[PDB]
Scaffold this active site. Sequence first.
Site, short mmCIF file in Angstrom:
data_model
loop_
_atom_site.label_atom_id
_atom_site.label_comp_id
_atom_site.label_asym_id
_atom_site.label_seq_id
_atom_site.Cartn_x
_atom_site.Cartn_y
_atom_site.Cartn_z
N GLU B 13 38.76 26.58 39.82
CA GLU B 13 38.18 26.58 41.21
C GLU B 13 38.07 25.06 41.59
O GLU B 13 37.87 24.66 42.74
CB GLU B 13 36.88 27.03 41.13
N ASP B 198 37.19 39.65 45.85
CA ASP B 198 37.15 41.15 45.63
C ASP B 198 35.98 41.53 46.37
O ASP B 198 35.43 41.04 46.94
CB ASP B 198 37.00 41.30 43.91
N1 LIG Z 1 37.87 36.39 34.78
C1 LIG Z 1 36.83 35.24 34.24
C2 LIG Z 1 35.46 35.29 34.52
C3 LIG Z 1 35.03 35.20 35.77
S1 LIG Z 1 33.44 35.49 36.26
C4 LIG Z 1 33.53 35.22 37.93
C5 LIG Z 1 33.43 33.86 38.35
O1 LIG Z 1 34.13 33.55 39.65
C6 LIG Z 1 32.91 33.29 40.66
O2 LIG Z 1 32.94 31.80 40.65
C7 LIG Z 1 31.76 33.66 39.94
O3 LIG Z 1 30.54 32.98 40.52
C8 LIG Z 1 31.68 33.48 38.53
O4 LIG Z 1 31.80 32.23 38.09
C9 LIG Z 1 37.00 35.27 32.52
O5 LIG Z 1 37.33 36.41 32.12
O6 LIG Z 1 36.97 34.18 31.95
N1 LIG Z 2 32.06 41.03 41.88
C1 LIG Z 2 31.49 39.62 41.51
N2 LIG Z 2 30.20 39.73 40.93
C2 LIG Z 2 29.61 38.63 40.57
N3 LIG Z 2 30.31 37.46 40.63
C3 LIG Z 2 31.58 37.43 41.34
N4 LIG Z 2 32.40 36.54 41.77
C4 LIG Z 2 33.62 37.05 42.50
N5 LIG Z 2 33.26 38.36 42.53
C5 LIG Z 2 32.13 38.55 41.81
#
Ligand SMILES: N[C@@H](CCSC[C@H]1O[C@H](O)[C@H](O)[C@@H]1O)C(=O)O
Ligand SMILES: Nc1ncnc2[nH]cnc12
EC number: 3.2.2.30
Lengths: 230, 230
Positions: B13, B198
Site C-alpha cells: 500500500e 473486494d
Molecule cells: N492477504 C494478506 C492479508 C491482508 S489483510 C487485509 C489488509 O488490507 C487492508 O489494508 C486491511 O485493512 C488489512 O490491512 C496476507 O495474507 O498477508
Molecule cells: N473484507 C475485508 N475485511 C477486512 N478488511 C479488509 N480489507 C479489505 N477487504 C477487507
Amino acid sequence: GQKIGILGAMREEITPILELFGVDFEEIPLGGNVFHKGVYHNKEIIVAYSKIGKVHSTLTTTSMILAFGVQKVLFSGVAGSLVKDLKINDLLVATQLVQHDVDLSAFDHPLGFIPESAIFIETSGSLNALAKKIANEQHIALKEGVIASGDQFVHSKERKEFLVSEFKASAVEMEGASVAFVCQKFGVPCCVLRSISDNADEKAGMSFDEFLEKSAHTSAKFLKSMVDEL
Amino acid sequence: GQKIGILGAMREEITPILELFGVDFEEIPLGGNVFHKGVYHNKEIIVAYSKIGKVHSTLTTTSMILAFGVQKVLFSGVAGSLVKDLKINDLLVATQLVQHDVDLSAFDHPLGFIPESAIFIETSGSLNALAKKIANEQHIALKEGVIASGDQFVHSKERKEFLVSEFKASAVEMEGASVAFVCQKFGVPCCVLRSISDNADEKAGMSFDEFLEKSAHTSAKFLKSMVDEL
Ligand SMILES: N[C@@H](CCSC[C@H]1O[C@H](O)[C@H](O)[C@@H]1O)C(=O)O
Ligand SMILES: Nc1ncnc2[nH]cnc12
Ligand SMILES: N[C@@H](CCSC[C@H]1O[C@H](O)[C@H](O)[C@@H]1O)C(=O)O
Ligand SMILES: Nc1ncnc2[nH]cnc12
C-alpha cells in the site's frame, strides 16, 4: 536509578497502587491519559490506567515508552479464569500472551497470527523469575500461564472452550497481549500480573463487579513487593 | 513548512506512494517500523506501513506523532465494500469510524462502545473537504461513509449484514478506526482514504489478491493529489 512504568486498565486497578506507594505524585496529561510521575526509594515511577482494550492499552504503553523513557513495564489488573485450577483472587503471571480475536483465516493463516508478527508474545524472564521468588518468600501460590487478550469481555462456556483448545490459555483479559507486544518492539522488559475476578462464564459480569476491588488490591499489593526489590 | 504523516497498512500500500513522490527518502527504524522521511515541495513527509491490525496501526500512529511531530495524518489503503453502491476500485473517504469487534455487552453496553470513549470516531473536516474538492476537479466519483475496523478479515454475508445494520457501515477494514482514534487523542487532523478491493463476502480473499495492487495505486494516486494542495 531506573525508570519503571506501572500500568492498569481501569482507574480502580491503579488506585491501590498510588496508595500502597504512598508518595507524592505529579500528574502529567498526555494523549488522553493522566500519568502519575513520582520518586520512590530512588526509583522514578510512572503510573497510569490505559482504559479498556487493545487500542487504549497500545497507545498508553507506547506513550509511556516514548515520552517517559521507562526501562521496565509492570502491568497489574484482573482477569477471567479458563481453568478449574485457577480460582477467584488467585494470582497469575503471564509467560506468553496471544491476541485471541485476530482472524486472517480467509488467507489460510492460523488464528491469532498476523503476517510479520507471531502468535505468542513472550514476557520478561528476569521479571517473571523475580515474581516467583517473592511469591515463595511470602507464601503466595503464584501460578504461571498463557493469557489470551481480545476486545471482548468473555462470558460464555463456548468461547472459554475455544480459548483453551486453540491457544491453551489459562486466563483471558483485554490488554495483556497489546502491552507485551509494544514492550517487545521497543526492547523493554515487561511483566503481566493478573488476579482472577471471575470464571469467564455466563455469570462473569456478576462475579466481576463483586470482586473487582479485592482482586485489584491483591494484584497491586504483589506488584509493589516486586518494585521494592528492583 | 508542515510535517505530514502518510500511512499504509501493508508494504504494497505504500510502495506506490514512495514512487509517486519520487524524492529521496532517509530510512529511520523505530519500534519495529521503518519510517521514510524526506522533503517534498517544502513539506516534510514521513511515510510508513504499520503492518496489519489495530495494535500494529495504533503503535505506528502513536510513534509518528510522538517521535516525528507530524501535524497531519493521511491514511491510504484498500477496504471491503458492504454496500451494493460501492464497487471494486471505487474511492471512499471515511467520515466516521467504529471498532466493530468491541464487545462489552456483558455489562449492558452497546456494541462498539468502551467506557471513557465513544462508538464513532470523527475525521478531519478540512481534509475531507479538500478531498471532495480535488475529487470534483479531477472527475473522480469520491464517496463518503462510515468505515468499520476490526481485527478480522471479513468474508461472510452474515458478518456483512451485521456491520451494516448495527453500524450503518459502508466499508470494512482493519486499521482505520485505530489510526483516527490516536490522532483524535493528540489533536492531529486525520484523513482515511480507502479503495475497494473486494466485497467482504465468501469470495473476498480471492478478489483481494487480484485487485490489491490496482486498488492500492488508485488510493495512493489520490492521496498524492491531496499533498500537492497542502
Ligand atoms: N492477504 C494478506 C492479508 C491482508 S489483510 C487485509 C489488509 O488490507 C487492508 O489494508 C486491511 O485493512 C488489512 O490491512 C496476507 O495474507 O498477508
Ligand atoms: N473484507 C475485508 N475485511 C477486512 N478488511 C479488509 N480489507 C479489505 N477487504 C477487507
Ligand atoms: N465493568 C466495566 C468493564 C470492565 S471490562 C473488564 C476489564 O477488567 C480487566 O482489566 C480486563 O482486561 C478489562 O480491562 C464497565 O462496565 O465499565
Ligand atoms: N471474563 C473476562 N473476559 C475478558 N476480560 C476479562 N477481565 C476479567 N474477566 C474477563
